[PDB]
Symmetry: C5
Subunit: 103 residues, 5 copies
């Protein structure tokens, strides 16, 4: 199913704006305590060890929103937003939102 | 009513831009520290304990915004944003914004 | 005057993109303490005493931006964004931004 | 040159998408303290003594972004975002972003 | 490849929305703490010492995202977002996102 951070799907028309949908996943204090504290210079995502866990939580959040959108009978999510929140300095949450849509 | 994170609604053009509407809900420190401090690795909202409360908060904020838009005579909200704010060590505030519109 | 979180005003043409405009309002550590950090479970905006103040602050920010756009001879604000920031230990800023425009 | 938080410029087609450009400015710990610490209830931008240094930090970030755009051959910036980040304990950073464009 | 905040590339047709892509880089506590420390009043980037490693970080995040879009078969990135998160005790992450697209 098509997911996009744009407001539309070029060439396709939206017949239905079904609902705003969301997904999240949380990374515990211990995981974020060490994979991020290991960083000493400017370390990118390929090189660093923090990315696969971050990407894992982001994909969990993505698929939750996808599953929710699909189970509402949508065939696209537009206007997708990706947000990161560090709750009590340890709990890094990744939240996704967007509009479940019929095209 | 129709709510969308997108700048417009396709096929139904906007007759009047009424106002910027908002809604919020706050999760208390005890509850945030309680349920969000869970997870020892990476856990989604789909299979968690914190989501239920986060989704409760998000839905309240959403309901508030739609109600306010109703009151203002709106029959759609476009350009919707869902953001999150760690207001203290504890609290998370979910804030929703968007433009109350009549189509 | 027309303020929208959308990129345009349907049916009307933007003649000039005059400037990016801003408004802020800051909430004191005591006010955030007493009203915001009191919340124990989940409290929405209609039920929380925090709201009248958050709305007051947000309305101050919005009015400050509108007037500043008025100063510049604009008759529209487009691409409006609402932001919240913990600016000092215990303090809360609402910052609004947008594009002052002539339709 | 033209700067806008909207996703485009009306009536003026984009010839080239040159680069995403960025600007920042930072206020010292001292500065945040002396102008924010004093705030008690709700204090807006027009009235607040904090507003001139903040607007100065923002205007510096903007100028630096505009200057980089100009150096890249651009004559407009579109999709401008304004960010506030408490970077060290005491200090506030204002970061701006957008796409440097040719119209 | 073309990277843009906009949802479309003017005079170019998006023939596939491939995937939402992401890039990150993290600045460790050292070069955050003892490199933003020199800030006094209000200091801009191209006059401060800090627009070196901060920019370097952004470029790594962007380069990561672009490289991932390339591996997915994309030849442009649209709806791009630049985010900043303080991740721990004085640690700055720049996270970028966008939709990997075929034009």
């Amino acid at each position: 199913m098509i997911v996009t951070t744009t407001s539309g799907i070029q060439g396709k028309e939206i017949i239905e704006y079904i609902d705003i949908v969301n997904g999240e996943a949380i990374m515990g204090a211990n995981i974020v305590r060490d994979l991020f504290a290991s960083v000493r210079d400017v370390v990118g995502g390929r090189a660093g060890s923090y990315e696969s866990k971050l990407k894992e939580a982001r994909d969990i959040a993505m698929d939750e929103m996808k599953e929710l959108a699909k189970q509402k009978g949508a065939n696209a999510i537009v206007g997708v937003d990706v947000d990161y929140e560090v709750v009590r300095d340890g709990m890094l949450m990744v939240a996704v939102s967007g509009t479940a849509v019929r095209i």
